[PDB]
Symmetry: C3
Subunit: 495 residues, 3 copies
């Protein structure tokens, strides 16, 4: 009899962590940091709903393809949702210059206010109502983009247009016009009389003469003619003037950029649901509680950081061991109010008291190390949506290499952080147990025999009063020194 042991926590847990050295090492306590689930819905962003384009494309919406709903209310939006291949684009076929730049401008835009600038009924000198085509049905009749006017000769005359708009607003105006490319010479005269036409646009920044390119082309949604659209931003106190002798597709409405800020054009097939998040991905939404996730790289909002991994587990507590009679042999399921502690074994004592002078000091630096690593990735790379046309392959791939490039880097960083500080977390516990022992060993010196398993046996009488002497760094050799010098002489001369 008359013993004392130094040991560590153990418990029912089976959570598993990894290090540089070892795979799958069971631990008392561990915290997962990788979000891997999503809700498959398309939610609003902290109260603010997305602009859902339905089966339409940004060009369809802006130009007002008869198939796409105007947004009469002038709403703000948190992001824009476009299908992967929308069906309602340029219903009348053609091209839309610097389209992918316009889309990129939408990503920093949060609210438009549509405003009339040239009212459709103000083109006295031309036919403002025959410009419709079979390619643009609204309710089965022939129609046309709501937001632009296809001007056509009135009375076999086409008087040269010169018209101007002064932008008297505080905001930037986004303005869109177009020019018509007929398929033969006979049709050019049929529509605009003058055989040779142009479309001129002037602002202080932009000067452009546009000319009708007549070619023989396949049928797209029915026609072989084409229509090419342009666009520009008109700054406040600047004016724009158009002049043409034909082929001019004039704007009726402009778009007040009224709210800039964080936004995005997400490509997704989903539709809206009565729901809200702090983090949206194209395939659903994320419970942004954990610091990392692997659901999708193109997440927007207040999001955890994306890493290409399948799990990522911090270690916070000991390894998990029975495990009897001191630390050399494992940990004590019977310790519960700490991680490292002791075991009494006295004339009166039972055992199992914890040294939270070093257990709090360890839960101290552990949960302080824990989100100091979470915060050291606050600067991590968050990817951003961009699009490129068929003649921009090189930089599309430059952009791809760049975004995958950083994601691989930050993934490497994330993993190496966990593996390394895992190994240092466990290496800490051991040294903590191992110093508990020593704090006892350098108190009880002569008066006890090191038993080689992690316990000491007393060359004196202990009492419970004094077994707090050793826990508290209190025990003093002299007051039990003589009683021990006695008995060790007697084992020396025992049986």
């Amino acid at each position: 009899g008359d013993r004392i042991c130094i040991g560590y926590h153990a418990n029912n847990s089976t959570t598993q962590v990894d290090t540089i050295m070892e795979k799958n090492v069971t631990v008392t306590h561990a915290q997962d940091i990788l979000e891997k689930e999503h809700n498959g819905r398309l939610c609003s962003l902290k109260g603010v709903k997305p602009l859902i384009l339905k089966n339409c494309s940004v060009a369809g919406w802006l130009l007002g393809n008869p198939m796409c709903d105007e947004f009469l209310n002038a709403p703000e939006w948190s992001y824009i949702v476009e299908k992967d291949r929308p069906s309602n684009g340029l219903c009348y076929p053609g091209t839309f210059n610097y389209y992918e730049e316009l889309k990129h401008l939408m990503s920093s835009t949060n609210q438009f206010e549509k405003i009339q600038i040239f009212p459709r009924s103000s083109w006295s000198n031309h036919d403002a109502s025959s410009g419709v085509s079979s390619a643009c049905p609204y309710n089965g009749r022939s129609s046309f983009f709501r937001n632009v006017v296809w001007l056509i000769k009135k009375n076999n005359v086409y008087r040269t247009i010169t018209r101007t708009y002064n932008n008297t607003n505080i905001e930037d105006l986004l303005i869109i016009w177009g020019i018509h490319h007929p398929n033969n010479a006979a049709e050019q005269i049929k529509l605009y009389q003058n055989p040779s036409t142009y479309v001129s646009v002037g602002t202080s920044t932009l000067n452009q003469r546009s000319i009708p390119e007549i070619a023989t082309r396949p049928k797209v949604n029915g026609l072989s003619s084409r229509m090419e659209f342009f666009w520009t931003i008109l700054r406040p106190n600047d004016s724009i003037t158009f002049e043409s002798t034909g082929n001019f597709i004039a704007p009726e409405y402009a778009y007040k950029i009224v709210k800039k800020g964080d936004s995005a054009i997400m490509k997704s097939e989903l539709s809206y649901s009565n729901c809200d998040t702090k983090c949206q991905t194209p395939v659903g939404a994320i419970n942004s509680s954990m610091p990392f996730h692997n659901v999708h790289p193109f997440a927007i909002g207040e999001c955890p950081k994306y890493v290409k991994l399948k799990k990522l587990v911090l270690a916070t507590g000991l390894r998990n061991i029975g495990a009897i009679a001191g630390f050399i042999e494992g940990g004590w399921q019977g310790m519960v109010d700490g991680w490292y502690g002791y075991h009494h074994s006295n004339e009166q004592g039972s055992g199992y008291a914890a040294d939270k002078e070093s257990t709090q000091k360890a839960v101290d630096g552990i949960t302080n190390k824990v989100n100091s690593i979470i915060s050291k990735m606050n600067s991590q790379f968050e990817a951003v949506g961009k699009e490129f046309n068929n003649l921009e392959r090189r930089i599309e791939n430059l952009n791809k290499k760049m975004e995958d490039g950083f994601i691989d880097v930050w993934t490497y960083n994330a993993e190496l952080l966990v593996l390394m500080e895992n190994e240092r977390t466990l290496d800490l516990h051991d040294s903590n147990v191992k110093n508990l022992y020593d704090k006892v060993r350098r108190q009880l010196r002569d008066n006890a025999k090191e038993l080689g398993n992690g316990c000491f046996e007393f060359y004196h009488r202990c009492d419970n009063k004094c077994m707090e002497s050793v826990r508290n760094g209190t025990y003093d050799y002299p007051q039990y020194s003589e009683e021990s010098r006695l008995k060790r002489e007697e084992i020396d001369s025992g049986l």
Copy 2:
């Protein structure tokens, strides 16, 4: 007499590793991970040979400059080899719009099948044979690109061309045509009669009128006229139609894109050799066995990862120490079946038995740590070839900064990994030796005297039977306890 020592491996090796702390530290065992050699040849890629353009440029090949060999067999290729400054490009001088994009499309292309679409002999209404020039010799005569036709007025007439090709294939067609820019008004009429011409191309995606730009230019390979080429991809079930009144350089053959996949345009001066690899660089080929290399950044195939370093050496074993009588003093050349072990010294014994209960457990986590680091760079940045024209300097440099940017990062990563896990590999060995000792010390307690060099001297009689008691965690104090309590009393009272 009556001793036992705890010591470690040492041997003839002189391999040197580095850490954060120290340079050039000799070790028992080490493994190099940096490939630094190449074979200076240009080999096939795992059975599949490269398309070697010889003295020609991608434009020369595609257009079929009379100097460049057609590839009649329609071969597939693993990569494309272009000289740094080929001599057979546009032999007739001009430009080739979105050339560097076309080159980039080749990088994802593995096989072409050339196919006739407008047979040279089907232009009844024009002269299909006078379009040759002194700038394009084949066998010293005047000639011209094999794959396009220089159409010229037949009989002082040039009837307006309108011709169409429906792409009835499953594959994408790559199609190339051109327009002629004469040097004076008199020559334009000399060749095409009509003073004012155009070249119109239509597909469902592309609409383009092209117009002859007459200027006065220097002589390039003899001429002052110019020729500008265009190109487009015609998707299946789409058609293309050309129409012109002159200056039209019509396609004869199109290129079926038949195999897409991994490929590349390597710039190299070398030529092919009877040889094969899994990794090709522009300056030769690589024995892809090791995980890193430093031969060249633009390597293709199944390649080790490029890092800008001169050596990179993993440490796997101990430091390298004579080194006599226990671990405090160095390692034992005489231990051979392990890394850590013991030394007998008995009434019968010699010494030098290894504790492979902790030597296998160390060769365990070492070669497991070894390629866990190799695999943690499986996601590393691999650079990709791209080209940019003289007006694309900014993004050419963006691309350069990006690729050097990641290579510096990954090089830093690679080195810090080795240095750090080197320091933890050696720090492991020491703690392994140092725990061998303790496993012995906590067995033999009273019955032996710690000699301070790493050995114990027995206060009892040992025998070989029992010196496996201490190796095997077997030795039990009581069965030799009385014989020791005897003698230590007698040194206490000896001489």
Copy 3:
């Protein structure tokens, strides 16, 4: 009496370092590595002054807007300083094609030599003096760009111009011309007679017909006409020829690129001062001594590496503890010639001698670890200035994401390096103290009692002669063995 203690340095220092584990840990010795100050001036770069554009823009300078000073001396420059929004650009309004590419070419250019190529007085057939406008005042009169000529019909005639320059220099020539876009048909005839004009330019690389685009535009600095400029580099032994029938803005002077090399276009509002640096930022200059700084990302010269941090402190020495009687309790302010050492306490001795066999060996690997980390970031990402026009937003943001992307990475790297090697630096010190103890313990074995605080008490007589026996790894048990075996028997049998 008769003692000896093992302890460590401590001193007046209050410098604070951080690790993964703990914040704000005081240390004996530490070195700051983050430059955070600048001088707010704009200095020369190692003797070589910047080209200060004052209120002008690169286009103003090159074209020689009457408001911008020519640089008659043909100076070289280390960098170029442009205000954020200069006031002297195209005073005559228009555009300047591939402007941001030209600016990028300046960044690799260090010296121009302006040279006449078409002397203003050599246009016999046209009016070379009426081309001035109210938009370009010099000293209040009407004027025009010094470096180009606005050619205007002489005598209601405009004979077709064809003029050529052979570049007979070793250097690349930078050449700039322009074309005039009038506001109405009547003005085009007023200035150039011929109603329909063109501007043709030929080199071996460039072929271009330019055509006057007449539109109705707002007034910029007074006018509604516009002027569009072009530019090209003419390589040596190549020639260029222009021809026009009107609207031609002809070059007078060209720019010999005479010195290429490292340079930059810094945007800054500052002006020059009598001052020099090795590192310039847009907001001032940097004492490039430390390895990292956080003043500004766009620093040029021989600069420390930019990291987005507020402090970065290496730990080099111990923690900072009174701290009495051995290492278990703290460090000794009284040790001064080392970091770890001893304390005598003898029949004659006082104490406090240092073991610089392990103190030099620690100042060894510490200052070797110190700039091995500084040198492991020698490859770090240095950002580079680039500009993009309003239709290049996507790649402008690609470039921004890329540069912030690497800066976040390298900042993470920098911090993790310090935190981790800080923790290993302190963890070293402790193990160094802790091995000092042991080197003593395994010498003095039986002959001393471990006192549990870090000191030993001698079972024999020591003398100063022998207390170097223990410092020097010299002390040998036998020569004091008998005197100790005596007294320990007497404590066993003492009071």
